Amino acid sequence: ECSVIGYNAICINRGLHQVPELPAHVNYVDLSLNSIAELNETSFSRLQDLQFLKVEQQTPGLVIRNNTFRGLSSLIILKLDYNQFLQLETGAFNGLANLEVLTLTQCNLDGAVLSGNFFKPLTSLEMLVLRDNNIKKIQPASFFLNMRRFHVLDLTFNKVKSICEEDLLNFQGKHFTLLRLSSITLQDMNEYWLGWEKCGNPFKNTSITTLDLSGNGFKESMAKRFFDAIAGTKIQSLILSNSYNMGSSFGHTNFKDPDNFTFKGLEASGVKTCDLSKSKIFALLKSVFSHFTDLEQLTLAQNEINKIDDNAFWGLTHLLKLNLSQNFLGSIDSRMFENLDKLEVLDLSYNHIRALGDQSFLGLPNLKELALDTNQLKSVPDGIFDRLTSLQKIWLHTNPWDCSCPRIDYLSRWLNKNSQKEQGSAKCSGSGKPVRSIICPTS
């Protein structure tokens, strides 16, 4: 009843209660959405050439007995997701010394799946996906010290109580390309927690390319203690989007915006990109980013930013890209973008902007891309763009441009001379003609 196409066997939703007879040469088999209640050593006896196997989403309670995969020395990818109440014997993965990818998302598994010997046979494991289980503590057993190519771990949507040095002892020495700790709550790691000093550095002797800590609240007082704790950890990309407790929010008193101490622990981390989007930052305070001395890209999109204080960007000597889209800046002035000499891309779209100050973009000689679209600009000051000598692209559309003369004289002429740079089309309010086409009778 399976559909066999070359080396592929598709057995999706066939009402199967056991592994069916298949040609012995197939290397990809999909057994998802069937009613297999148990896998044992006889299950894949006639399929030793397997490289890619999916047995997702059986009816609840799939049991995988010892040595089910013994003999599958060619198996590289094993996906077993959405098996509700998945039952694993401790030798379930015997023989999978060459496996590289294992996915066990939404299987009601707990922390013993990492601390027990389940993954002990998996010496070649590189990527482990454990999303949306019941893992309350991350405590890898000692055999992880010898898993030399293990570099991707996804624990998103597990309610992890806390992460501490002694928990992650057996990840020390590792370099993760991706450590995804998104929406894991960390409820115990609050500002009052007595465990902070004992917690030490969970990422001691550990480097990370992308650290995803999004969706975890990260109230300022918490972020500060957390980054103090992991100080010195080499992180190239830090993801902290949807930090719903981060920032003081729109007109409020409870929570605080980050300040010059909040991220001090990341001082020596070598962070290149930082994502703080979809949080609730209201004001950018002075030197709040001054410890990101290697940072090249920073997004603050979709916050509640109304204010940028003097020297908010102090110390950002390498920043090339700044995304401030979908905030509430309302008006731009010269002081606001000081200390950004190397900036090449600036996104100010969707900010309810009605005014640009005279020297707004003065200190940005290397700016290549400037987005000002979807605001409320009726006009700009004369000469506002003349010092942007590196400029390649500009967005000015979806603004209610006032095309009366001689008010529109500078902008219409500038947009015409620089027509190859304009992305989209700025339009006169009322008439709807391109601003670039207006020629004022005088100047």
């Binding site: 070359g6 598709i10 999706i12 990818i77 998302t105």
Partner: protein, 192 residues
């Protein structure tokens, strides 16, 4: 090469369970099996599959599809199996399956289909398995007459392998078999 979010083996490309909001680009034209199940795909771009002329299996179950773009499958003349279960399909475009002469398995159960457009299955000469259960079929509407006439003529291939059979294609609210509705009981005015 294999798309970033995807895993490849032979002529198989599996992009399942990757929180995808759209179909990945750069899918090799040699692809015979494409898996996009268990993602957050909400819409398909018109002609997104035109490149994959060698596709025989397209798996799209457990996404957030509400409808399909017209002629989206017309290049896929070698398509054998098509999986659409657990989406939110409210309607199918006229003649989306017309080119699928070799299609043996069509899986449409657990969606939000009220009806099937006239002649939608007429070109499916190779059809062995079709699943249509768990849909709110509007039996008061007169457009259901095609589905009625078709499933009563091909009842052996409807919901087989203990999926209820032709009787598991049920009416919305009354839970009556669709094959048992009369033309007199239906009306063009009760069509939304």
């Amino acid at each position: 090469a294999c798309p970033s979010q995807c895993s490849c083996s032979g002529t198989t490309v599996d992009c399942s369970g990757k929180s995808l909001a759209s179909v990945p680009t750069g899918i090799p034209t040699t692809t015979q099996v494409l898996g996009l199940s268990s993602n957050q795909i909400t819409k398909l771009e018109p002609g997104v599959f035109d490149s994959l002329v060698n596709l025989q299996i397209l798996v799209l179950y457990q996404n957030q599809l509400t409808t399909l773009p017209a002629g989206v499958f017309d290049r896929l003349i070698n398509l054998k199996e098509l999986y659409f279960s657990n989406n939110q399909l409210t309607s199918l475009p006229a003649g989306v399956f017309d080119k699928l002469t070799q299609l043996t398995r069509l899986e449409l159960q657990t969606n939000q289909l009220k009806s099937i457009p006239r002649g939608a299955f007429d070109n499916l000469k190779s059809l062995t398995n079709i699943y249509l259960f768990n849909n709110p079929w509007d039996c008061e509407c007169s457009d259901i007459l095609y589905l009625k006439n078709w499933i009563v003529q091909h009842a052996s291939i409807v919901n087989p392998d203990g999926h209820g059979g032709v009787d598991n294609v049920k009416c919305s609210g009354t839970n009556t078999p669709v094959r048992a509705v009369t033309e007199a009981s239906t009306s063009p005015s009760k069509c939304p």
